[PDB]
Design an enzyme around this catalytic site. Structure first.
Site, PDB file in Angstrom:
ATOM      1  N   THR A 170       0.845  -1.200  -0.098  1.00 26.64           N
ATOM      2  CA  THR A 170      -0.046  -0.052   0.216  1.00 26.64           C
ATOM      3  C   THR A 170       0.777   1.471   0.082  1.00 26.64           C
ATOM      4  O   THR A 170       0.724   2.041  -0.900  1.00 26.64           O
ATOM      5  CB  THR A 170      -0.974  -0.003   1.176  1.00 26.64           C
ATOM      6  OG1 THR A 170      -1.840  -0.965   0.932  1.00 26.64           O
ATOM      7  CG2 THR A 170      -1.901   1.295   1.327  1.00 26.64           C
TER       8      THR A 170
ATOM      9  N   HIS B 251      -7.331 -10.203   2.831  1.00 22.57           N
ATOM     10  CA  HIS B 251      -6.464 -10.727   3.898  1.00 22.57           C
ATOM     11  C   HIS B 251      -7.331 -11.966   4.708  1.00 22.57           C
ATOM     12  O   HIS B 251      -6.501 -13.116   4.965  1.00 22.57           O
ATOM     13  CB  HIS B 251      -5.813  -9.822   4.924  1.00 22.57           C
ATOM     14  CG  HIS B 251      -4.765  -8.863   4.030  1.00 22.57           C
ATOM     15  ND1 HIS B 251      -3.656  -9.224   3.715  1.00 22.57           N
ATOM     16  CD2 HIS B 251      -4.960  -7.589   4.006  1.00 22.57           C
ATOM     17  CE1 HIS B 251      -2.939  -8.494   3.585  1.00 22.57           C
ATOM     18  NE2 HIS B 251      -3.745  -7.315   3.489  1.00 22.57           N
TER      19      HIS B 251
ATOM     20  N   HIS C  10      -3.112  -2.412  -5.471  1.00 20.25           N
ATOM     21  CA  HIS C  10      -2.481  -3.709  -5.589  1.00 20.25           C
ATOM     22  C   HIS C  10      -3.700  -4.763  -5.681  1.00 20.25           C
ATOM     23  O   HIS C  10      -4.639  -4.394  -5.103  1.00 20.25           O
ATOM     24  CB  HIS C  10      -1.558  -3.921  -4.715  1.00 20.25           C
ATOM     25  CG  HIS C  10      -1.930  -4.061  -3.381  1.00 20.25           C
ATOM     26  ND1 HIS C  10      -2.789  -4.746  -2.521  1.00 20.25           N
ATOM     27  CD2 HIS C  10      -1.740  -3.138  -2.179  1.00 20.25           C
ATOM     28  CE1 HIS C  10      -3.185  -4.443  -1.248  1.00 20.25           C
ATOM     29  NE2 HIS C  10      -2.503  -3.361  -1.431  1.00 20.25           N
TER      30      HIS C  10
ATOM     31  N   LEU D 146      20.410   4.216 -14.980  1.00 17.68           N
ATOM     32  CA  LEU D 146      20.672   5.149 -16.122  1.00 17.68           C
ATOM     33  C   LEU D 146      22.187   4.866 -16.531  1.00 17.68           C
ATOM     34  O   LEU D 146      22.903   4.291 -15.707  1.00 17.68           O
ATOM     35  CB  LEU D 146      20.829   6.326 -15.528  1.00 17.68           C
ATOM     36  CG  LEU D 146      19.415   7.069 -14.610  1.00 17.68           C
ATOM     37  CD1 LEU D 146      19.638   8.396 -14.177  1.00 17.68           C
ATOM     38  CD2 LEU D 146      18.274   6.895 -15.639  1.00 17.68           C
TER      39      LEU D 146
HETATM   40  C1  LIG Z   1      13.070   8.668 -12.070  1.00 18.11           C
HETATM   41  O1  LIG Z   1      12.867   9.925 -12.044  1.00 18.11           O
HETATM   42  C2  LIG Z   1      13.422  10.651 -11.219  1.00 18.11           C
HETATM   43  C3  LIG Z   1      12.805  11.887 -11.150  1.00 18.11           C
HETATM   44  O2  LIG Z   1      13.223  12.776 -12.259  1.00 18.11           O
HETATM   45  C4  LIG Z   1      15.048  10.408 -11.573  1.00 18.11           C
HETATM   46  O3  LIG Z   1      15.885  11.045 -10.502  1.00 18.11           O
HETATM   47  C5  LIG Z   1      16.381  12.397 -10.705  1.00 18.11           C
HETATM   48  O4  LIG Z   1      17.581  11.916 -11.303  1.00 18.11           O
HETATM   49  C6  LIG Z   1      18.387  13.120 -11.954  1.00 18.11           C
HETATM   50  C7  LIG Z   1      19.451  12.542 -12.887  1.00 18.11           C
HETATM   51  O5  LIG Z   1      20.321  11.555 -12.015  1.00 18.11           O
HETATM   52  C8  LIG Z   1      18.694  13.749 -10.667  1.00 18.11           C
HETATM   53  O6  LIG Z   1      19.323  14.975 -11.353  1.00 18.11           O
HETATM   54  C9  LIG Z   1      20.113  15.453 -10.475  1.00 18.11           C
HETATM   55  O7  LIG Z   1      19.793  16.963 -10.138  1.00 18.11           O
HETATM   56  C10 LIG Z   1      20.436  17.584  -9.254  1.00 18.11           C
HETATM   57  C11 LIG Z   1      19.947  19.085  -8.638  1.00 18.11           C
HETATM   58  O8  LIG Z   1      20.938  19.772  -8.177  1.00 18.11           O
HETATM   59  C12 LIG Z   1      21.927  17.842  -9.760  1.00 18.11           C
HETATM   60  O9  LIG Z   1      23.048  18.259  -8.861  1.00 18.11           O
HETATM   61  C13 LIG Z   1      22.636  16.456 -10.204  1.00 18.11           C
HETATM   62  O10 LIG Z   1      23.966  16.594 -11.115  1.00 18.11           O
HETATM   63  C14 LIG Z   1      21.570  15.727 -11.228  1.00 18.11           C
HETATM   64  O11 LIG Z   1      21.317  16.600 -12.332  1.00 18.11           O
HETATM   65  C15 LIG Z   1      17.761  14.256  -9.762  1.00 18.11           C
HETATM   66  O12 LIG Z   1      18.104  14.695  -8.560  1.00 18.11           O
HETATM   67  C16 LIG Z   1      16.741  12.832  -9.543  1.00 18.11           C
HETATM   68  N1  LIG Z   1      15.708  13.561  -8.904  1.00 18.11           N
HETATM   69  C17 LIG Z   1      14.970  12.812  -7.858  1.00 18.11           C
HETATM   70  C18 LIG Z   1      13.460  13.233  -7.366  1.00 18.11           C
HETATM   71  O13 LIG Z   1      15.398  11.658  -7.261  1.00 18.11           O
HETATM   72  C19 LIG Z   1      15.287   8.986 -11.701  1.00 18.11           C
HETATM   73  O14 LIG Z   1      16.798   8.925 -12.599  1.00 18.11           O
HETATM   74  C20 LIG Z   1      14.363   8.266 -12.754  1.00 18.11           C
HETATM   75  N2  LIG Z   1      14.720   7.043 -12.732  1.00 18.11           N
HETATM   76  C21 LIG Z   1      14.887   6.196 -13.777  1.00 18.11           C
HETATM   77  C22 LIG Z   1      15.014   4.799 -13.688  1.00 18.11           C
HETATM   78  O15 LIG Z   1      14.502   6.905 -14.870  1.00 18.11           O
HETATM   79 CA    CA Z   2      24.252   4.045 -13.664  1.00 17.85          CA
HETATM   80 ZN    ZN Z   3      -2.911  -5.543   2.415  1.00 15.76          ZN
END
Ligand SMILES: *[C@@H]1O[C@H](CO)[C@@H](O[C@@H]2O[C@H](CO)[C@@H](O[C@@H]3O[C@H](CO)[C@@H](O)[C@H](O)[C@@H]3O)[C@H](O)[C@H]2NC(C)=O)[C@H](O)[C@H]1NC(C)=O
Ligand code: CA
Ligand code: ZN
Ligand code: 5JK
Ligand code: NA
Ligand code: NA
Length: 783
Positions: A154, A260, A304, A669
């Site tokens: 959940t 459940h 779910h 990534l």
């Molecule tokens: C799923 O989506 C989230 C959100 O878009 C992705 O996480 C984000 O990933 C980016 C790239 O690594 C992060 O960017 C960073 O931003 C900071 C801001 O100052 C910068 O200093 C870094 O160099 C970089 O550009 C970002 O923080 C992050 N955001 C969150 C909320 O976690 C994630 O990659 C996505 N996952 C997949 C598997 O696509």
């Molecule tokens: Ca990687």
């Molecule tokens: Zn449950």
């Protein structure tokens, strides 16, 4: 100090003053007269004829007085009982072409009706059990099922719905979790969960507030009855224009609780489902009373499903580990293992690996979990994970319950529901199944909000909507390929490779010709990062060769239904040929593989599928070679030699794009060069963490893959590149007994591959880009 005139108020009173809001009970902080003035139950929730036009008695739970619409506190059937109007469910369905909102309404409100543990198959019970839900389903837009996130619990799923993020990114990785930076544990019960430190990303209510759109309080103390939750939403909808929210959430604990207790297929489940339908009917009757039934967008969604799980199907870790006192287990339908006192993780995994023939869980280091789960990149996720078989529990040591959930999110029993109903959703429209991560963007579109960055693919659900604010555009290519000609001579290379006349007579060897036409059916992938790479053409395949990684980023080829499989001859077993289009310095060398005792090599285009003996020699080019562990070659060779031809035979030809993935930091990534933690010994040839393949054909199987007029059909895989086959308990047997099973576990979306590679696929088709985005989010589940 009193709740008089303040019941379910929207302004949250700060500490220490007593509260009258949705959550005051949960903080044990309501005013002395809250349970009396606000949680009134007297006379029930339905008007009767004898109450029509009554004087207001404040003790009554809801009202049938002539002043009740001015508060929004009438019983939801008031007008049916007292004014001769019909129930919403008894009215014929009528398309809502444009929103029909009354005075004061700037935008169509959104109501999210979330139901806990509502399995997709419960929808098969039909209108005799659930007439209101069935009307919403048949007259609006619905999917056969909606896929939840892993774990299928959940808290992770409600928060994914709210944020569009995977649990690893939003931080709510379980109903229970431990954070080593806080040195604290989060649980369903207790005060810890109310601390903001746990909650990442940007949920819908915050996105709304930041952009000037008012949000109702999404959360409901469990002690507030469901009838009251509905009446409170309707009361809020009756507020003045400057105080009224545009977005609301209703949450129900059912049918989860009964699931459940009795299991998903118990006859006892009918009554809970009847009660939820009644609640929906109350909401729709209530909206009809306020003239909002052709104005509001309603989303009926579950978090779910539910599976048959009983206490005698429990695996105990004490039956595998002799040192169970040294570990902490988050138990149940998944396992997460941690040290008790900060034991050795590698010995723990080995002790849990294929120890009994019918063992009902499998251990993984989190980085080795199927990448489709996206369940690794968070310090709250323990290194050791147990994926538990459907219908089973795992516990630490050694019926009242008959159902549970939490299993792998592609399991059929974990699938849940989606229905959208209202002016902005389509009319009487069925849509394919989709993932709950996609809804945040749609909910943002439905409210006129710019979504925060999230894991949805914005535009992949445009086909749910009658009218679309957001039009997706295809990203621009960053790196432009080179197209090198035959530059170098054989004599110029010294790669330590070997081989055992007609190339000399062929002036246009390795020119484009018709290669791009027949082997790149959907245009070349775009490279969306900065790098240096070469397009290489051959009779049977085309590739994008990276000069940085010394291997293809992608290799593309088409195999017809009628294609012949041939063997690699004895004299070509160890053949590797230098590529005269690419310099010695940007090429791999065979001595590195001789030096590395652990590492061997494979080919991206398979020699087994060459079109002629002449063409086969291209498959042994150094630029088609990739580092592979011997253990992984058993998998890869079987896929290449046997499965590709099978798929070609079943699907009327297939187009295949294969390549390496590097993800050493398990963030989902593409790694930079600096993040690559392993190379072939004595070299700068990087070792892939995974190998992908994307297998495309015509959805209309009466057309061959290379002459498809219409929608495409895709399945894809991200196989872990492992030095052993410990994951596959049958692996000592013939590859026909285990390889295909392994690959189905590691099924993937094209979008998953795009993130892991920095590539963009399907750039040249006859389909709309929104249709392509839907294709890219598709997951072939094998269920
Ligand atoms: C799923 O989506 C989230 C959100 O878009 C992705 O996480 C984000 O990933 C980016 C790239 O690594 C992060 O960017 C960073 O931003 C900071 C801001 O100052 C910068 O200093 C870094 O160099 C970089 O550009 C970002 O923080 C992050 N955001 C969150 C909320 O976690 C994630 O990659 C996505 N996952 C997949 C598997 O696509
Ligand atoms: Ca990687
Ligand atoms: Zn449950
Ligand atoms: C069902 C009850 C027993 C539990 C109630 C749900 C509870 C976990 C909710 C209540 C308040 C919520 C926070 C609040 O809305 C504001 C934010 C700001 C945003 O930036 C991150 C989310 C957060 C902290 C909410 C998280 C969920 C909370 C604690
Ligand atoms: Na070797
Ligand atoms: Na094995």
């Amino acid at each position: 100090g009193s709740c008089k005139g303040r019941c379910f108020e929207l302004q949250e009173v700060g500490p220490p003053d007593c509260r009258c809001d949705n959550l005051c009970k949960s903080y044990s902080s309501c005013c002395h007269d809250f349970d009396e003035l606000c949680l009134k139950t007297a006379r029930g929730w339905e008007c009767t004829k004898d109450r029509c036009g009554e004087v207001r008695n404040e003790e009554n739970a809801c009202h049938c007085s002539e002043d009740c619409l001015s508060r929004g506190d009438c019983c939801t059937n008031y007008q049916v009982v007292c004014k001769g109007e019909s129930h919403w469910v008894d009215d014929d369905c009528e398309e809502i072409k444009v929103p029909e909102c009354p005075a004061g309404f700037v935008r169509p409100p959104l109501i999210i009706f979330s139901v806990d543990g509502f399995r997709a198959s419960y929808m098969k019970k039909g209108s005799k059990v659930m007439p209101n839900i069935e009307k919403l389903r048949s007259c609006g837009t619905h999917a056969p099922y909606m896929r939840p996130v892993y774990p299928t619990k959940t808290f992770p799923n409600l928060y994914t719905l709210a944020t569009g993020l995977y649990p690893e990114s939003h931080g709510i990785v379980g109903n229970s979790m431990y954070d080593p930076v806080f040195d604290a544990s989060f649980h369903l019960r207790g005060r810890e969960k109310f601390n903001h430190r746990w909650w990442g990303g940007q949920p819908l209510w915050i996105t709304a507030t930041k952009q000037g759109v008012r949000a109702g309080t999404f959360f409901w103390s469990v002690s507030i009855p469901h009838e009251r939750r509905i009446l409170t939403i309707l009361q809020w909808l009756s507020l003045p224009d400057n105080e009224r929210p545009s977005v609301y959430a209703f949450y129900s604990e059912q049918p989860d609780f009964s699931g459940h207790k009795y299991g998903p297929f118990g006859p006892e489940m009918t009554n809970p489902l009847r009660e939820i339908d009644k609640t929906v009917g109350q909401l729709m009757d209530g909206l009809k009373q306020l003239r909002l039934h052709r104005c509001v967008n309603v989303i009926f969604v579950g978090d779910h499903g539910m599976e048959d799980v009983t206490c005698d199907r429990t695996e105990f870790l004490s039956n595998y580990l002799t040192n169970v006192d040294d570990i902490t287990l988050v138990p149940g339908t998944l396992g997460r293992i941690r040290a008790k006192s900060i034991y050795d993780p590698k010995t723990i995994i080995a002790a849990l690996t294929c120890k009994k023939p019918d063992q009902h869980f499998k251990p993984y280091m989190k980085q080795h979990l199927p990448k489709r789960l996206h369940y690794a990149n968070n310090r709250r996720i323990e290194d050791i994970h147990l994926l538990v078989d459907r219908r089973w529990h795992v516990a630490r040591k050694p019926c009242f319950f008959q159902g549970d959930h939490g299993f792998d999110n592609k399991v059929n029993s974990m699938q849940t529901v989606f229905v959208g109903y209202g002016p902005t959703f389509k009319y009487r429209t069925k849509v394919p199944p989709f993932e709950n991560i996609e809804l945040y963007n749609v909910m943002c579109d439905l409210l006129g909000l710019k979504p925060a960055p999230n894991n949805g693919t914005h535009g992949s659900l445009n086909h749910l909507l009658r009218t679309n604010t957001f039009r997706p555009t295809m990203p621009d290519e960053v790196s432009r390929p080179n197209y090198p000609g035959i530059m170098y001579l054989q004599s110029e290379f010294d790669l330590g490779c070997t081989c055992d006349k007609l190339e000399e007579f062929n002036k246009r060897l390795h020119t484009k010709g018709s290669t791009k036409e027949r082997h790149l059916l959907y245009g070349r992938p775009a490279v969306l990062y900065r790098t240096s790479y070469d397009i290489l053409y051959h009779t049977d395949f085309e590739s994008g060769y990276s000069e940085i990684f010394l291997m293809p980023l992608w290799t593309s080829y088409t195999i017809s239904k009628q294609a012949e499989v041939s063997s690699i001859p004895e004299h070509l077993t160890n053949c590797v040929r230098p590529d005269v289009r690419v310099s010695p310095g940007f090429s791999q060398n065979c001595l590195a593989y001789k030096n590395d005792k652990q590492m061997s090599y494979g080919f991206l285009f398979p020699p087994y599928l060459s079109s002629s003996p002449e063409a086969k020699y291209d498959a042994f080019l150094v630029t088609n070679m990739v580092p592979m562990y011997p253990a992984f070659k058993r998998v890869w060779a079987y896929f290449q030699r046997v499965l590709v031809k099978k798929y070609a035979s079943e699907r009327n030809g297939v187009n295949v794009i294969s390549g390496p993935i590097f993800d050493y930091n398990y963030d989902g990534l593409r790694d930079t060069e600096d993040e690559i933690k392993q190379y072939v010994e004595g070299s700068s040839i990087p070792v892939p963490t995974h190998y992908y393949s994307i297998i495309t054909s015509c959805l209309d199987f009466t057309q061959p893959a290379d002459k498809c007029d219409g929608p495409l059909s895709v399945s894809s895989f991200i196989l872990p590149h492992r030095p052993d086959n410990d994951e596959s308990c049958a692996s000592s047997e013939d590859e026909s007994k285990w390889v295909e099973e392994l690959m189905k576990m590691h099924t993937a979306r094209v979008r998953d591959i795009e993130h892991l590679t920095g590539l963009d696929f399907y750039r040249k088709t006859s389909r709309s880009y929104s249709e392509i985005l839907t294709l890219k989010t598709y997951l072939h589940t094998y269920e």
